[PDB]
Amino acid sequence: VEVLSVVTGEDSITQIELYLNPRMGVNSPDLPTTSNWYTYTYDLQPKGSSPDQPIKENLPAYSVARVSLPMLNDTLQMWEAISVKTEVVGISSLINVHYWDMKRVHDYGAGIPVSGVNYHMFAIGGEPLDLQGLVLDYQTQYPKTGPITIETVLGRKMTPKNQGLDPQAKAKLDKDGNYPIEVWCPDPSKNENSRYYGSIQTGSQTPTVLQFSNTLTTVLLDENGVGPLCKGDGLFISCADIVGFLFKTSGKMALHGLPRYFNVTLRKRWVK
Amino acid sequence: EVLSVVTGEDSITQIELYLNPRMGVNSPDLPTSNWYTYTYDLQPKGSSPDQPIKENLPAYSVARVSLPMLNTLQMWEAISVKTEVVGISSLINVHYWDMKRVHDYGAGIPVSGVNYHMFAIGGEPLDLQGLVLDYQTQYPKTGPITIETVLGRKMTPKNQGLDPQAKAKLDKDGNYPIEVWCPDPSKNENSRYYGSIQTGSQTPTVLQFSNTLTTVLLDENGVGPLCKGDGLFISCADIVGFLFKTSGKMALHGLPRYFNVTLRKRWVK
Amino acid sequence: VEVLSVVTGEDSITQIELYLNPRMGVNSPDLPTTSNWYTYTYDLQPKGSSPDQPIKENLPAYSVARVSLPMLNEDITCDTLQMWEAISVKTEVVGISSLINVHYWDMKRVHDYGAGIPVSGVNYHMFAIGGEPLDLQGLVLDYQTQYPKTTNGGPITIETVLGRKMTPKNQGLDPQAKAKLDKDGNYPIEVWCPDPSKNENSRYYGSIQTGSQTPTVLQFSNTLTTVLLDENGVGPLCKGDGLFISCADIVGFLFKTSGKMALHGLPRYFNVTLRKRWVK
Amino acid sequence: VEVLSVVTGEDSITQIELYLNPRMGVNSPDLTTSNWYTYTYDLQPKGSSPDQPIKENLPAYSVARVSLPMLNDTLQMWEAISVKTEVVGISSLINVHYWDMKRVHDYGAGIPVSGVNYHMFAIGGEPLDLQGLVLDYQTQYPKTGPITIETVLGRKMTPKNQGLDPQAKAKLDKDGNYPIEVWCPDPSKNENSRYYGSIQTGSQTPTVLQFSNTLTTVLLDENGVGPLCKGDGLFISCADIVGFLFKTSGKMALHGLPRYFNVTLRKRWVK
Amino acid sequence: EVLSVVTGEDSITQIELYLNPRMGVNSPDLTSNWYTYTYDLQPKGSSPDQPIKENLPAYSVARVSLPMLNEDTCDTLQMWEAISVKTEVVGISSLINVHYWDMKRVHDYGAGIPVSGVNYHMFAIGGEPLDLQGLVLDYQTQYPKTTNGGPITIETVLGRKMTPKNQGLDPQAKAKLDKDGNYPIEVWCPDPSKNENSRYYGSIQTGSQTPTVLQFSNTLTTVLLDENGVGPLCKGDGLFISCADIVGFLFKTSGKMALHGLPRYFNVTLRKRWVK
Ligand SMILES: [Cl-]
Ligand SMILES: [Cl-]
Ligand SMILES: [Cl-]
Ligand SMILES: [Cl-]
Numbered sequence A: 001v002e003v004l005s006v007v008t009g010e011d012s013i014t015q016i017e018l019y020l021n022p023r024m025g026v027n028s029p030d031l032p033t034t035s036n037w038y039t040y041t042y043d044l045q046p047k048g049s050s051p052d053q054p055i056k057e058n059l060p061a062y063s064v065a066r067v068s069l070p071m072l073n074d075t076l077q078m079w080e081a082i083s084v085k086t087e088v089v090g091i092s093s094l095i096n097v098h099y100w101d102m103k104r105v106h107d108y109g110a111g112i113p114v115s116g117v118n119y120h121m122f123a124i125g126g127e128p129l130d131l132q133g134l135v136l137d138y139q140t141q142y143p144k145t146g147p148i149t150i151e152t153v154l155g156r157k158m159t160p161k162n163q164g165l166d167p168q169a170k171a172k173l174d175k176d177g178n179y180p181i182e183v184w185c186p187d188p189s190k191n192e193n194s195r196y197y198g199s200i201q202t203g204s205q206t207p208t209v210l211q212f213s214n215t216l217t218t219v220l221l222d223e224n225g226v227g228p229l230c231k232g233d234g235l236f237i238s239c240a241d242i243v244g245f246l247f248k249t250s251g252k253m254a255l256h257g258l259p260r261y262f263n264v265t266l267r268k269r270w271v272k
Numbered sequence B: 001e002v003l004s005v006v007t008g009e010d011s012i013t014q015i016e017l018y019l020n021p022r023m024g025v026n027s028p029d030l031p032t033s034n035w036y037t038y039t040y041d042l043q044p045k046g047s048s049p050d051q052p053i054k055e056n057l058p059a060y061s062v063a064r065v066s067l068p069m070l071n072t073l074q075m076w077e078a079i080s081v082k083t084e085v086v087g088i089s090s091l092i093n094v095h096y097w098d099m100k101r102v103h104d105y106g107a108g109i110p111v112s113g114v115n116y117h118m119f120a121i122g123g124e125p126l127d128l129q130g131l132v133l134d135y136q137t138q139y140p141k142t143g144p145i146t147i148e149t150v151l152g153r154k155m156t157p158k159n160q161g162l163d164p165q166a167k168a169k170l171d172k173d174g175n176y177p178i179e180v181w182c183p184d185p186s187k188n189e190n191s192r193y194y195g196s197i198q199t200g201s202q203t204p205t206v207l208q209f210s211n212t213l214t215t216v217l218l219d220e221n222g223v224g225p226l227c228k229g230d231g232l233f234i235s236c237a238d239i240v241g242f243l244f245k246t247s248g249k250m251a252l253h254g255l256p257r258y259f260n261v262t263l264r265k266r267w268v269k
Numbered sequence C: 001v002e003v004l005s006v007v008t009g010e011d012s013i014t015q016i017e018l019y020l021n022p023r024m025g026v027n028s029p030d031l032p033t034t035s036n037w038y039t040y041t042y043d044l045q046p047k048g049s050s051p052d053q054p055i056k057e058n059l060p061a062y063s064v065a066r067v068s069l070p071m072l073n074e075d076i077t078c079d080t081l082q083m084w085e086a087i088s089v090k091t092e093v094v095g096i097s098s099l100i101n102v103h104y105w106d107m108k109r110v111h112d113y114g115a116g117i118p119v120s121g122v123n124y125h126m127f128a129i130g131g132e133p134l135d136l137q138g139l140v141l142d143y144q145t146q147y148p149k150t151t152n153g154g155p156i157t158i159e160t161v162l163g164r165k166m167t168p169k170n171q172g173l174d175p176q177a178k179a180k181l182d183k184d185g186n187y188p189i190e191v192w193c194p195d196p197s198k199n200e201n202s203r204y205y206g207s208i209q210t211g212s213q214t215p216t217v218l219q220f221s222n223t224l225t226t227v228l229l230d231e232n233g234v235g236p237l238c239k240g241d242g243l244f245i246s247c248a249d250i251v252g253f254l255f256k257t258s259g260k261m262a263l264h265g266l267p268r269y270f271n272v273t274l275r276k277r278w279v280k
Numbered sequence D: 001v002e003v004l005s006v007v008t009g010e011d012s013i014t015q016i017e018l019y020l021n022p023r024m025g026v027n028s029p030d031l032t033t034s035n036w037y038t039y040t041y042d043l044q045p046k047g048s049s050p051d052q053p054i055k056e057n058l059p060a061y062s063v064a065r066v067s068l069p070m071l072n073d074t075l076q077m078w079e080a081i082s083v084k085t086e087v088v089g090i091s092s093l094i095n096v097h098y099w100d101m102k103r104v105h106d107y108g109a110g111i112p113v114s115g116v117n118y119h120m121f122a123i124g125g126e127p128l129d130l131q132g133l134v135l136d137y138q139t140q141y142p143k144t145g146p147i148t149i150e151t152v153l154g155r156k157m158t159p160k161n162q163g164l165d166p167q168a169k170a171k172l173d174k175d176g177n178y179p180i181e182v183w184c185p186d187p188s189k190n191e192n193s194r195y196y197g198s199i200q201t202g203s204q205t206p207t208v209l210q211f212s213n214t215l216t217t218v219l220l221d222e223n224g225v226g227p228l229c230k231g232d233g234l235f236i237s238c239a240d241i242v243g244f245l246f247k248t249s250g251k252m253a254l255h256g257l258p259r260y261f262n263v264t265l266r267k268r269w270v271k
Numbered sequence E: 001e002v003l004s005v006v007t008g009e010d011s012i013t014q015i016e017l018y019l020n021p022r023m024g025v026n027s028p029d030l031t032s033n034w035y036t037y038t039y040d041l042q043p044k045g046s047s048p049d050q051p052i053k054e055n056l057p058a059y060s061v062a063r064v065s066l067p068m069l070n071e072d073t074c075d076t077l078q079m080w081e082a083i084s085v086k087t088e089v090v091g092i093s094s095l096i097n098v099h100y101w102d103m104k105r106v107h108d109y110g111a112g113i114p115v116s117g118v119n120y121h122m123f124a125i126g127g128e129p130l131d132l133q134g135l136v137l138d139y140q141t142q143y144p145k146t147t148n149g150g151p152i153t154i155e156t157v158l159g160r161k162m163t164p165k166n167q168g169l170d171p172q173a174k175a176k177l178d179k180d181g182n183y184p185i186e187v188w189c190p191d192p193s194k195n196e197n198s199r200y201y202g203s204i205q206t207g208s209q210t211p212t213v214l215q216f217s218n219t220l221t222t223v224l225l226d227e228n229g230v231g232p233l234c235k236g237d238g239l240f241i242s243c244a245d246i247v248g249f250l251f252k253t254s255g256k257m258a259l260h261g262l263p264r265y266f267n268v269t270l271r272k273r274w275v276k
């Protein structure tokens, strides 16, 4: 790519709106009987014997969408993403401490609120996000494809090197609800045409602390003033928002997600 | 379409008000009213379905303020606000008569735990999106306005996520539960809102107050919220934590919020 | 009031130094026997039954002083006069280091054979600089609280300013429950906060921290300066040539062997810079 | 080593990408005890003296010397001006269903990785300078294996080694050989390196970490000079302890993650 | 009266040093097995408190001799002026040690409880000794006598017994940090009403098991200039450097607890300044 000048004219600027619903394990709300736990996992438990053999419902996954932009056309125009407004939706729902099956903090008290393990990330790019594979335990037996994991891309069993960084463990984030978060992270050695921002918080009952405001804007331009450039007139948007554990009366525990909203501003750019 | 700021003698004004919290016990003059600014006891039943009482549903505060009439017309434009949570100092009380002790012979457990704080300034009612923790919750009929009220029918599993139909406007004080409605980011172009949450059960309540802090309400193009029909809409929620009772029972508590908005006259097409 | 230009001259800038010792409940160190708990409350606890009847010693109050400034004018009849204007302040909490003491003889231990539980839990910190007394708004946790009557030697509370008993509305903001910080150790912190609807000629800064053993986290440095000018470049203006200084610094609980608990507070230092200003 | 002007030209700028896998104790994935790669063994106070820690319970610094292109009295040197760095695999720490994980309570999820964190990275034109200091001087470290204060002194530690001893100094020249708990960056040297670190103590303290491809560190000092690579060698160093793996039995092991680097360099004239 | 910066070849100097902590066991040259620690800290259980010197962490301090400048007791003179400092706590990484043999296990069969809890961090740079204020938790506490090997406390500088006012701000209880290991932290804080010729920076963290959280970097610099652009002026050609760095508790198997401290390094930059 050779980046030229910013197009000037009538319709040089456009805006994109959308939302992405979470993919925590029970991914659809339309299924006959299972959909009651939509936006949650099933119960998460150490097995007690080897090896771990987790079910797809216990594997929170990344959200993705390819957004179609107005069609523009070896010298050509491309859409350049310059900024974004993003926000986690439904934060106020987490004040509910009276859910029928909530474990009481102590005898005759309110429920333990959704708290503990958080994971938040969003990404905007002109092509699918690049992913690096790495797991806590290489002997974990993940389901076949279904979710895509390390042994799905290698075509063979994981070895101990997959507890660290293995250059062969790479994939592209092209499918909604299909790449487990505990297996995949953004690959820093690529993603030149993408911008990502993320964080984690561990612990069991750690406070969930979140802000929301319609006045916050993220600038997407790099150090040369270039934003992600959209190949084939497609904008790729990605995220994950785990907001903590639902604590059940029995002692069982499930992870919960929230949806994320996006407003992206783009402009036309000459490239060769 | 926005034109030029009005240059004149009396082109700037100041709006000053407060909003008392609406936690469930909403009025201070009832036969009952002893729990004004609190909920009743919050306690998961243990078997389904949940059917919450209206006194256990903290709701948004809102007020419409009438502005001096002005009439291509002139409109009031909000440009900045000073806002403050009132009575923060009251939470040092660790000797409420029926306060659960921290340990034997010790002081009471102070108001702490779940905090929720937001405020909004707009030229029209705040736009709301509905999303609940549990879709099988039996919210009181219309009393409080919830997703069932706006849809006409029962909630579906999809209301545990973002349902595009689950929309409403914050037009009534003490009538929209916080746990059902949050501000809608797909709209609200003529409003500015700011909010945060903190979960946990004994998480310290940590708050600041100062008369030196100002929020600028202008957007990127130098434009504030425009008051159509000479009405400024002010909205807030301020949950400060639980009061812990001897029995083990717990109730949520709120504090009032103070406002001082500055407006200027603006030409519009 | 019309603010004019800054006075240009020789002795146009002055400094004002002082400190205020905390008013936690035991407020004097000169008293016969009980003065061993100076800078502390007594033991705080729920009564068990209605209503609460708290004592003086269990009620931390705000500290305050009026400081007399050098007189500026040789004629008061003039429409235009010089007034002192506070522009900046250095302020610090004194004795923060003392809180490393985990060997008070009657300290509850963290566990068997261990050190004492350090001063921790509830914190409340505020200070104000103004050209008049700080404006206050009354608000309480529980309106049924029976505070000692001011006539009986007690502090000043909401009933005191209303002439009658509190009602359920005093758990919210009640326009009638207002007062002014003019006596040192007489306005209880749990009753009165600063009034944001007034206080245009004062600057206030504050915070709270709840929880029972929450860490006390505090900073100190003689390099920190708070600018006192408003958005128009005008600081508090000293009417009657008096500068009012207010504060409150609760730093946590002292945990006694039996399980009983008292709040503790620290003194505060101020150095205020003032300039001369013309007013109409 | 007097610094002159920045070299102007076509190929005056170059970029170095690499990653380093963590060295927690079990350091190779190729040995057979390698299934504990990126972890220590079980850390467990004995209850009586002395402490004789095994080499698998001593997380060490990661390091690489990168060979830069040939450049050549006055000569050209590579100067490090900026770095993009990121901790890799942070999302793996959401797993709370490891087969032998201790539960938070009955029927509950496993306790997530948390507690003790230690993060640091350094970019330099030469090896990083180290200072020795230990919790307890009586600790019997394994003999050379790991390089410790006794190794560099010849004789045994004394009580002064619980504070700063100017004789306890070393150079970070070997990957997985210098124990984090013995060696810290030496602030009295390191003029030709930049370093950044932090620690967090506690047992179940949350692990709180960020990642973004938008963050850059500027390596220039106050005079506008970055580290200068002597003999064309760039030294990259790091450590990233992310907390404890809590096991069913009561036992606990420390865990580490890998760190990725993209470093920008320019040619500089020196005398 | 502060005049102009002296312009020349050798008008700028740099001063380097470290300070080892004074936690109670202050020498490594013996009982020195507990150097950089206190002894065991325990509420006595009965009145009054009579604490041993090994249980009183104290401030570190050093005077540094600077090059002689005035080759003459004149009206106008050259003085060294401190303008910036790089400072750093040393040995932070040592606190990842969770296997010390005597470290209390978090739970049955687990790792030790790390060093954590009470933290106190301060550093100062000045042209004269740091000015101190005395204030104590309990005025009844009986600190050991100075002439019997012990530290300097309020009783020492008063020449009479502490009273209840010493639990607040008493203006008569003031002093100078002119001795290392002699002034206890729990007794003395920096006096904000003086120290016009010093710059101090401090903080505290209480609680029993609070995470110790510290940063280290050779890129961080503190600017020592006041609002008029003047650094501390070294009269008598002496530079005063002070500090304290308590990093938490060592939790012992038996339940007993001791406080721990770490060393601090300083790189100060100074220039020559004309003064009246
Ligand atoms: Cl997070
Ligand atoms: Cl909040
Ligand atoms: Cl506070
Ligand atoms: Cl850290």
Ligand SMILES: [Cl-]
Pocket (backbone or CB within 6 Å): E119, E120, E121, E203, E204, E205
């Ligand atoms: Cl600290």
